[PDB]
Amino acid sequence: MLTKFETKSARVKGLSFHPKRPWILTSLHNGVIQLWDYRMCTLIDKFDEHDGPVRGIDFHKQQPLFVSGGDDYKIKVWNYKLRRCLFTLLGHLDYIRTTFFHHEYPWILSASDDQTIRVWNWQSRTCVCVLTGHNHYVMCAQFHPSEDLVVSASLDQTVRVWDISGLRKKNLSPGAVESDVRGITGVDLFGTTDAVVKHVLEGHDRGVNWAAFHPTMPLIVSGADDRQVKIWRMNESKAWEVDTCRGHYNNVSCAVFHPRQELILSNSEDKSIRVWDMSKRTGVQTFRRDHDRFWVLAAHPNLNLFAAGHDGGMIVFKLERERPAYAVHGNMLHYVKDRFLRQLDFNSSKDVAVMQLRSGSKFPVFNMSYNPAENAVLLCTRASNLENSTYDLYTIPKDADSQNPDAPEGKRSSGLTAVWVARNRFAVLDRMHSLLIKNLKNEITKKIQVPNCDEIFYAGTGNLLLRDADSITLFDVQQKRTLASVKISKVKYVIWSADMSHVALLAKHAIVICNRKLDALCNIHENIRVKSGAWDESGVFIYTTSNHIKYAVTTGDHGIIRTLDLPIYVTRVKGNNVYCLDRECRPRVLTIDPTEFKFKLALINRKYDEVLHMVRNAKLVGQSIIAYLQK
Amino acid sequence: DPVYAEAYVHVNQYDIVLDVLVVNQTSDTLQNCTLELATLGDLKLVEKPSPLTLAPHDFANIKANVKVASTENGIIFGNIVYDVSGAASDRNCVVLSDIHIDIMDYIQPATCTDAEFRQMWAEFEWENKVTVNTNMTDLNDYLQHILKSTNMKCLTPEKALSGYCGFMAANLYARSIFGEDALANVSIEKPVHQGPDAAVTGHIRIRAKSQGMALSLGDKINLSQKKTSL
């Protein structure tokens, strides 16, 4: 959706994205190591680790620290946060590619680009492990599935996979049947970097730029020093696996797996990033945007962001389905991600994306609408523009890939989008790649109606009709004469107080509160182009207010119920078991505590008992007497 | 968290002062993290209540005085990243950049001889203007309101008449706390039955040395101009 910030500079060999933070820590072979905790578009520190080049970047594994490597040959761990050096050893005859931190007796592993990597005890001083099996110049060193099992990629044209021990390398085994590492149709070669038949895999492909692992798995996704970046699965080991990854023009420095995405991202040198599948695999497309020279690609293990690294420089792009679809079922919120997965009600520790049988932020959505029941939803998938998509409508009791056409809380059919329209029971369905009207008394509805064909606006987006009408326009099932349009506007959604009758309105930036239909009760505006505020039902105004979560207003009252928890936005109100959202994370299930309602009523009847009883007692937070306690 | 901390800013007389409620409704003077000092703008933040316990079920007032005449930091409009840290009974915290730091307030009214003024008006940093047009009021009440809001000066009247129309252009001057003088001529229609003014279509000409603050001021005032849901 947006590439938040972008200047091309840096000639980048090594890279990492913060699995915890939206940092990028970047290694240039300018000799530079940089941590920028990328969030606030600001570098925390920048040390050009030595005069010579810098190849390596790896995680310590903790929260915010770098373990770093230069042509110094030195393993440094320095905490940005603590701006200090943790324990120190230099390095052999080449730089350090991967590191891991362990702790029987706060104990340490260091992975290196030369010769050996040594694993050291500073407590009850003994040897956990010795790794020989590297030579010089490691492009991409890796922890395996078993984290402390590993792979390395070399400019010595080998790959090393090692076995470790608590008293140096060894494994005991005797049950298997054939091997995929090497044992049936196809398979790729051993290299030489070490000397024990674990598997030294052949890193010859003019040398290997990157190696990347498959967690439980031994598939590797690779950057290679050949146009050929050749993919091999050692969880298969295909033939036409002797695949050379092809640009149009030269190279494929890297091509990578994204933890989450069952895909390959390739990047190259004709000025390009090239786009690849890996779910059913195939070169999708090539994308060109300069830099005829790169060596890294990355997708966050935080998965926050995604980015591609190059010689001439770098780019980070940010994703969103700015604003994205919903359904309500008792004391529960449904979301469809702008970015981010579920978060479809209730919470438990830090942030929880709601994973349920009512998969919300997940599918390939054109549109999502509750089909009210505490037991039903209607859903369009395959999203997008087509002739038409599929909608598979699902039961809250148990959703499915497509639920039963037999069942009418499961039905699927074909159709592109389904959309509400005003004077509430007519609907739009698109079941042609254009204007079908959908109209039903029921809102378990899936109805098809070409009459009301009326283009003069060709298939696009609106929801009480607003192909940017800038009005919500009311109709029946055919007509060639407007009933009427009212000039008011939407988020491109109209908010109903649960089902399909909310005179509480969304607007994209701003949202307006109405009672049902246009009665502009009050009109909301804020100016942060991000969050939410919530209604319980028709116009119950909850507003989020910092680490404080607030009722904007009730009866004649205003109140702080309970207090927020870093950013949250009120989305809306699912029952008493309260639900809150920052956008799609930074979330709540919540024991309530209203303030105000009770209050202007209470107040109105002079009544205090409650407050008192709560023993609730502010008046200042900046102030807080100023609702009317000032007045 | 039990520990709920709520905070807002109070700027009480020069001093922008930090109301903090850290309420530690914690189950103990839970360990607390870390905080860091800094030069600020013509201010510097300057206090921290020392301890780092998040005393159980307990409420606390944590005060930050800020130093309001020094610490240049040129991160305009403030909006500078600030840290409360995750450094002890805390895994995270809040890192925040501020927003909420605006102009209309800062500048005080200030004054001039008109001929010289005109000469000057023209002379000044021309480079910013914003338009006045639209509201909820007559520029009598409206003007007064705006004036008070920014705490700034309109230098002089000619009786021509801010009433029957007027077809008056109002010249305004102000000087701030860190001393910029800002000049305006806004020329405005003005309310009155089937005569003219319930919009303006008056142009607010803003001169302030940097265009960036200056225009921004024109905006700021634009925010100021009307009265609606922030």
PDB file of C-alpha atoms in Angstrom, chain A residues 66 93 115 137 200 250 255 288 297 303 334 342 350 357 392 416 433 461 470 498 531 538 540 542 605:
ATOM      1  CA  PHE A  66      23.252  -6.982  17.301  1.00  0.00           C
ATOM      2  CA  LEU A  93      40.298 -15.046   9.145  1.00  0.00           C
ATOM      3  CA  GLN A 115      37.469 -22.127   9.274  1.00  0.00           C
ATOM      4  CA  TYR A 137      33.867 -15.689   3.060  1.00  0.00           C
ATOM      5  CA  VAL A 200      28.484 -30.586   2.782  1.00  0.00           C
ATOM      6  CA  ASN A 250      21.582 -11.630 -16.230  1.00  0.00           C
ATOM      7  CA  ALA A 255      15.805 -15.267  -4.262  1.00  0.00           C
ATOM      8  CA  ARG A 288      12.140  -3.333 -12.706  1.00  0.00           C
ATOM      9  CA  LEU A 297      16.106  -9.356  -0.185  1.00  0.00           C
ATOM     10  CA  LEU A 303       6.766  -9.958   9.046  1.00  0.00           C
ATOM     11  CA  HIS A 334     -14.725  -9.532  13.231  1.00  0.00           C
ATOM     12  CA  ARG A 342      -7.328 -11.684  12.616  1.00  0.00           C
ATOM     13  CA  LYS A 350       0.369  -8.667  24.196  1.00  0.00           C
ATOM     14  CA  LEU A 357     -14.048 -20.660  12.658  1.00  0.00           C
ATOM     15  CA  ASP A 392     -18.658 -18.858  -0.031  1.00  0.00           C
ATOM     16  CA  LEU A 416     -17.943 -10.503  -7.872  1.00  0.00           C
ATOM     17  CA  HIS A 433     -18.783  -7.748 -13.199  1.00  0.00           C
ATOM     18  CA  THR A 461     -16.825   0.595  -5.069  1.00  0.00           C
ATOM     19  CA  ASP A 470     -20.441  11.603  -2.159  1.00  0.00           C
ATOM     20  CA  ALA A 498     -24.825  -4.370  14.524  1.00  0.00           C
ATOM     21  CA  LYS A 531      -7.365   4.423  14.079  1.00  0.00           C
ATOM     22  CA  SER A 538     -26.508   3.371  17.645  1.00  0.00           C
ATOM     23  CA  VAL A 540     -22.670   5.146  21.788  1.00  0.00           C
ATOM     24  CA  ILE A 542     -16.415   5.576  22.681  1.00  0.00           C
ATOM     25  CA  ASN A 605     -30.946  12.069  39.902  1.00  0.00           C
TER      26      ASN A 605
END
